Amino acid sequence: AGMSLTQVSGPVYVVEDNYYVQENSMVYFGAKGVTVVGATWTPDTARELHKLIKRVSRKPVLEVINTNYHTDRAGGNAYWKSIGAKVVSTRQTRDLMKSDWAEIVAFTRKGLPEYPDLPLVLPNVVHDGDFTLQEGKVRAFYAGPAHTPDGIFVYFPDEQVLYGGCILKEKLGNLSFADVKAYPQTLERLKAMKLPIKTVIGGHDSPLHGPELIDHYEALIKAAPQS
Numbered sequence: 001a002g003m004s005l006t007q008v009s010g011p012v013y014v015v016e017d018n019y020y021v022q023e024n025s026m027v028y029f030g031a032k033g034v035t036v037v038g039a040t041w042t043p044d045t046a047r048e049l050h051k052l053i054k055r056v057s058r059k060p061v062l063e064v065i066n067t068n069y070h071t072d073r074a075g076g077n078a079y080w081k082s083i084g085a086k087v088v089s090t091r092q093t094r095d096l097m098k099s100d101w102a103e104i105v106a107f108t109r110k111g112l113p114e115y116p117d118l119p120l121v122l123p124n125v126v127h128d129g130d131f132t133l134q135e136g137k138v139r140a141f142y143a144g145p146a147h148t149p150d151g152i153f154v155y156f157p158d159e160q161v162l163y164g165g166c167i168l169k170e171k172l173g174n175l176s177f178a179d180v181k182a183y184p185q186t187l188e189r190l191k192a193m194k195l196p197i198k199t200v201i202g203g204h205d206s207p208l209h210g211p212e213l214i215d216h217y218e219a220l221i222k223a224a225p226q227s
């Protein structure tokens with residue numbers, strides 16, 4: 001399918017968005033409504049995700065988290081706003097989105113000419129620190145710069161699942177926005193938290209991994225150019 005939505009543990013589901021370059025995002029089915037983590041690539045992909053959500057739950061989509069300011073994490077924003085979902089990010093992410101959205105859209109369209117020239121749609125709920133949703137069961141935090149300056153992690157303590165959006169994945173990638181030397185230092189700050197982790201969801205490539213995906217990517221980036 002163009003997109004799948006599949007349970008990994010309890011109320012925590014993984015989105016495999018096979019549009020453009022495959023990106024993986026998360027959905028949390030809560031008691032009052034649904035939290036989406038990663039807005040997906042475009043307003044059209046966001047609509048496709050909503051269609052899948054409505055086959056699982058009748059409860060409203062409450063909010064969507066932009067885990068960074070890039071197109072694969074914020075592209076769906078127009079759709080989510082249109083249905084009355086909050087679009088949530090850190091202040092850092094929101095500020096970078098305002099200044100750099102045109103730049104990231106242009107960069108995206110260099111490799112993906114078919115990708116739409118999306119207008120800026122900013123988060124309307126902005127956090128200055130770490131934050132939680134869903135009665136503390138979805139926990140977002142900053143541990144330093146990596147793939148971008150602003151990318152955040154989202155942890156699901158009940159299910160022991162960690163999502164890092166674009167930060168964690170199988171292949172190195174081309175690193176155009178990355179802080180190559182800080183990247184492993186951010187991964188080590190993450191590991192030093194000693195979070196109970198059974199599952200790490202990679203934001204690209206195949207999503208389902210164990211905690212060792214962190215070590216896998218750390219080793220790749222420590223061997224990279226400019227490391």
Ligand SMILES: [Zn+2]
Nearest residue numbers: 072166203204
């Ligand atoms: Zn990405």
